[PDB]
């Protein structure tokens, strides 16, 4: 089991006939543990803003969540645990573990609920595995 197979087999897998467009597992320091082939280049300020939003829910909501310079509208999330964004019919879920960040970026016809399913459940497993 590699970090790449966690992305390839447990994030980019089929979910009700749909697939994420991008997915990644990041250390909270901003380093890539593994990512899909075209996952956006996350800026240090974007990582810092994500970390701050988990620490202080509502931090990004008025200004937007940014991934590789692309702006997402912060929608309903889970305080301290899950960031969720929307950009048109697409969106993103960011699930925090104790040490890492689990990313999933989707487009139509995939839904936010299907993205939440794959991203949060893998993040839950990593937490239960001590990560």
């Amino acid at each position: 089991m590699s970090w790449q197979s966690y992305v390839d087999d447990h994030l980019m897998c089929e979910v009700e006939g749909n697939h994420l467009t991008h997915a990644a597992i990041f250390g909270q320091d901003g380093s890539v543990w593994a990512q899909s082939s075209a996952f956006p280049q996350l800026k240090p300020a974007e990582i810092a803003g994500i970390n701050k939003d988990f620490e202080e829910a509502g931090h990004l909501a008025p200004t937007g969540l940014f991934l590789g310079g692309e702006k997402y509208m912060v929608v309903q999330g889970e305080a301290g645990a899950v960031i969720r964004g929307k950009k048109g019919p697409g969106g993103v879920t960011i699930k925090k573990t104790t040490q890492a960040l689990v990313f999933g970026i989707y487009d139509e016809p995939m839904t936010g609920g299907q993205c939440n399913l794959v991203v949060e459940r893998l993040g839950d497993y990593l937490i239960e595995s001590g990560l």
Partner: peptide
């Protein structure tokens, strides 16, 4: 340094 990947579920 990433920790080792946990055993798969």
């Amino acid at each position: 340094p990433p920790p080792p990947p946990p055993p798969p579920p």
